[PDB]
Amino acid sequence: MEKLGDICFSLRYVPTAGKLTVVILEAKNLKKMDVGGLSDPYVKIHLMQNGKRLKKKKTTIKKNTLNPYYNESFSFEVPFEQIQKVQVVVTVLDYDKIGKNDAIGKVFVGYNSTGAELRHWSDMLANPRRPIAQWHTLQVEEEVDAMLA
Numbered sequence: 608m609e610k611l612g613d614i615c616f617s618l619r620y621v622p623t624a625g626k627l628t629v630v631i632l633e634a635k636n637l638k639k640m641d642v643g644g645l646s647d648p649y650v651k652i653h654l655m656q657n658g659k660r661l662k663k664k665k666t667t668i669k670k671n672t673l674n675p676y677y678n679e680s681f682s683f684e685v686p687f688e689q690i691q692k693v694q695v696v697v698t699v700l701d702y703d704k705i706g707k708n709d710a711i712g713k714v715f716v717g718y719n720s721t722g723a724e725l726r727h728w729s730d731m732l733a734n735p736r737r738p739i740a741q742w743h744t745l746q747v748e749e750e751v752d753a754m755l756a
């Protein structure tokens with residue numbers, strides 16, 4: 608579908624600690640969202656269960672780059688009886704000094720995820736020994752929101 612860029616993040620889930628850790632690592636080949644410029648990307652994470660947004664986090668903003676590096680870690684309290692139902696939604700947006708920020712693209716992993724998104728989630732569930740990083744193709748916001756609704 609649309610060439611919007613790719614996002615790399617790691618996942619780890621430790622049931623005895625009830626802790627899900629998501630590290631936003633880097634993105635690549637992001638779409639330009641500023642006329643006569645590049646983009647000023649930041650990343651949002653939503654933790655969702657049953658269509659309800661339970662937690663939200665945001666990375667810092669990187670100026671003028673289509674290939675940002677973050678290495679920003681976020682942790683979430685998720686008990687073992689809930690982990691199978693959660694969705695981790697990752698959105699890359701372009702910060703604008705004036706007006707609304709511009710969503711570049713979005714992806715989710717977790718309950719009801721598909722393809723490489725499901726694979727990453729499954730790998731996390733099987734291997735709490737270490738964080739597992741994987742790249743993900745960004746999709747247009749409208750498409751992902753439809754799959755989450």
Ligand SMILES: [Ca+2]
Pocket residue numbers: 640641642701702703709
């Ligand atoms: Ca813009």
Ligand SMILES: [Ca+2]
Pocket residue numbers: 647670671702704
């Ligand atoms: Ca800026």
Ligand SMILES: [Ca+2]
Pocket residue numbers: 640641646647701702703704
């Ligand atoms: Ca901008």
Ligand SMILES: [Ca+2]
Pocket residue numbers: 703705706707708709
């Ligand atoms: Ca704007």
